[PDB]
Design an enzyme around this catalytic site. Structure first.
Site, PDB file in Angstrom:
ATOM      1  N   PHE A   1       0.829  -1.189   0.000  1.00  0.00           N
ATOM      2  CA  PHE A   1       0.000   0.000   0.000  1.00  0.00           C
ATOM      3  C   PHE A   1       0.877   1.259   0.000  1.00  0.00           C
ATOM      4  CE2 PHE A   1      -1.970   2.910   3.322  1.00  0.00           C
ATOM      5  CZ  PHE A   1      -2.698   3.654   2.417  1.00  0.00           C
TER       6      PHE A   1
ATOM      7  N   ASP B   1       7.187  10.138  -4.909  1.00  0.00           N
ATOM      8  CA  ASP B   1       8.622  10.364  -5.096  1.00  0.00           C
ATOM      9  C   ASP B   1       9.046  10.402  -6.573  1.00  0.00           C
ATOM     10  OD1 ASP B   1       9.097  10.528  -2.355  1.00  0.00           O
ATOM     11  OD2 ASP B   1       9.485   8.387  -2.151  1.00  0.00           O
TER      12      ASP B   1
ATOM     13  N   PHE C   1      17.788   1.259   9.985  1.00  0.00           N
ATOM     14  CA  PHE C   1      17.306   0.717   8.721  1.00  0.00           C
ATOM     15  C   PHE C   1      16.984   1.774   7.664  1.00  0.00           C
ATOM     16  CE2 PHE C   1      15.595  -2.851   6.363  1.00  0.00           C
ATOM     17  CZ  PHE C   1      14.819  -2.216   5.426  1.00  0.00           C
TER      18      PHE C   1
ATOM     19  N   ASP D   1      18.853   5.262   2.956  1.00  0.00           N
ATOM     20  CA  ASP D   1      19.295   6.510   2.348  1.00  0.00           C
ATOM     21  C   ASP D   1      20.662   6.330   1.708  1.00  0.00           C
ATOM     22  OD1 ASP D   1      16.969   7.478   3.456  1.00  0.00           O
ATOM     23  OD2 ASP D   1      17.972   8.596   5.056  1.00  0.00           O
TER      24      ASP D   1
END
Ligand SMILES: NCCC(O)(P(=O)(O)O)P(=O)(O)O
Ligand SMILES: NCCC(O)(P(=O)(O)O)P(=O)(O)O
Ligand SMILES: [Mn+2]
Ligand SMILES: [Mn+2]
Ligand SMILES: [Mn+2]
Ligand SMILES: [Mn+2]
Ligand SMILES: [Mn+2]
Ligand SMILES: [Mn+2]
Lengths: 346, 346
Positions: free
Chosen positions: B91, B100, B232, B237
């Site tokens: 979802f 994004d 995490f 990143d």
């Protein structure tokens, strides 16, 4: 009239909704910017409509709970669950305007169309949904109907989401196929995408809050309400093209979005094979020239007159259903909701 | 290793998930096209990942329930709730790739980027969410933890959605302001957007299913797990820029999307006033030239080495927390989840 007296106390309760929603998490100063975005989203998207759905929760609550059992606190809950329905509405509308590519709603630019918002509207929408369940817990956590409401709202969302899927599968962009625009298809789509959340959801929430949780009683109220929903979506498809924007609050997009509208299903039925080709050639396109060509065929097959007649025959039929099914519930419950959508222009 | 043996039985359970989800509503042949779209959405978006989160539910369930109380049926439920976590994942990811503007995920094109899908992905996403609560009711309706799970999932969604809001408020497109990229801001964002659903959600679901519903016990497991979440997200990143796409399954977008990444926060700290201007001039732009300029500054301030060191100091610290907080729960619960994310490349 009954909706009229209840309106003021309902709308004013919205300050508290926003108050409680933007405080219970504001003991965490870190998410304060998010909570501020929440307040912003809420005041733009849950405000400016007719509040038919939320008022139905409130109106129907009073006609179902005995006056002694309508205390300050029990009422507070009724207004909150009413606004919970209004937030489900906001949630779905925000997403829907994106998916339908709508330009306005409730007389202002759509949330995703505001500069600075765009596809962030998505997360805003999911948030509105989350607020429903925050309020349920804050106000009804200890009530005996608490789980009933949680399951009713989720169930209702699943349904209107199955409804949306159907709606969108039937209207691929760039993919015109009048063949798929049938009466059965139309009936399924509107039952799932509108009927459940707009009509069954509010009355049933009010029922569960009033102790009426019996399965046959809900089945019976549902029989009435899915019919009113279907009338209500048909009226909405009509307004989409023939209603005045300064009144509906939105610019119609059904012909452009290649939608399985009521008008289009009615057209294809009354269409001579040469009108069929006009339609087949002008539907689901952004060209204004081609959209008017379609509207002209509708006016030519007298769809506005067909719709008016449907409104009459439909209204008499709902009335019959109320006569057959309202008991043991007060017929004023359904009568009130029916009066509010009869001959609406917005 | 423990996740390895459980994988096969988990993934295979997915046929039944799809079976039960596409049948219990298929006694209504009208929504069958929608149900078929569901099957399609599910198999594209809930399949192809590592299943860390869902497996955690399953793995942790066995280590918390006494072997006698791990019957065929009790296990069935564990696999379903595990897939419910996987659907929350689907979802959020579907919506997130849209917001994004991502190009791939799990080694294929993002759902909204598939021809014919687009912004319909939105409704697909909301549907995935709805399925969580359908399964909960189908499999756990009679369990004593049933309401605990429903509230845990909703609460968790609200949180990661507050997380997303924070994430997006901090990264306006076209609006570069390195000033807002602080350590506190970073810590808040990742705690809400990742930590809760990816780490607390699965373990807590497994706890509630095992009877462990005590408030202090959850608070204590949460202390461990929000830390692992933060590690995490930082690893995520880093991979976003320095990981291999053929492994992560996705193309990174953090510099272009003007994101409050870990790298960017670490850069601004080690930045000489002239590097600051480089960064201030090349961040949050689609130009590949300018994105490499940024990556070059990161490699120049030795961020890849800083990250490796953080990974070590972080891992030792989680370990301390496990030592301090794991009881009365089996330390193998957290150790297993910690081993699975240590030195990951995907
Ligand atoms: N309640 C559904 C929203 C609509 O009515 P709306 O005209 O966008 O309000 P749709 O025409 O997409 O069904
Ligand atoms: N779990 C969040 C999804 C992400 O990690 P993803 O790289 O898109 O998986 P984001 O970088 O947007 O936080
Ligand atoms: Mn629509
Ligand atoms: Mn619409
Ligand atoms: Mn409409
Ligand atoms: Mn993101
Ligand atoms: Mn992302
Ligand atoms: Mn990422």
């Amino acid at each position: 009239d009954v909706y009229a007296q209840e309106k003021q106390d309902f709308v004013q309760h919205f300050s508290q909704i926003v108050r409680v929603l933007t405080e219970d998490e504001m003991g965490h100063p870190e998410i304060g910017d998010a909570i501020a975005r929440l307040k912003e989203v809420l005041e733009y998207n849950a405000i400016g409509g007719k509040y038919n759905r939320g008022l139905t929760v409130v109106v129907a609550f009073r006609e179902l709970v005995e006056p002694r059992k309508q205390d300050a606190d029990s009422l507070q809950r009724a207004w909150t669950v009413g606004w919970c329905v209004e937030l489900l509405q906001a949630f779905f509308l925000v997403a829907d305007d994106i998916m339908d590519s709508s330009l306005t709603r409730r007389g202002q630019i759509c949330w995703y169309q505001k500069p600075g918002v765009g596809l962030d509207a998505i997360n805003d929408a999911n948030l509105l949904e989350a607020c429903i369940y925050r309020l349920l817990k804050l106000y009804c956590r200890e009530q005996p109907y608490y789980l009933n409401l949680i399951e009713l709202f989720l169930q209702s969302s699943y349904q209107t989401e199955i409804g949306q899927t159907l709606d969108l599968l039937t209207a691929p962009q760039g993919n015109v196929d009048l063949v798929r625009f049938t009466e059965k298809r139309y009936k399924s789509i509107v039952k799932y995408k509108t009927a459940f959340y707009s009509f069954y959801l509010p009355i049933a929430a009010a029922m569960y809050m009033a102790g009426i949780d019996g399965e046959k009683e809900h089945a019976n109220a549902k029989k009435i309400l899915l019919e009113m929903g279907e009338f209500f979506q048909i009226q909405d498809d009509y307004l989409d093209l023939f209603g005045d924007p300064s009144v509906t609050g939105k610019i119609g997009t059904d012909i452009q979005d290649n939608k399985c509208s009521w008008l289009v299903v009615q057209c294809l039925q009354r269409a001579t094979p040469e009108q069929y080709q006009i339609l087949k050639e002008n539907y689901g396109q952004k060209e204004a020239e081609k959209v008017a060509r379609v509207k002209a065929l509708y006016e030519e097959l007298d769809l506005p007159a067909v719709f008016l007649q449907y409104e009459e025959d439909s209204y008499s039929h709902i009335m019959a259903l109320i006569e057959q099914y309202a008991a043991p519930l007060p017929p004023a419950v359904f009568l009130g909701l029916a009066r509010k959508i009869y001959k609406r222009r917005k």
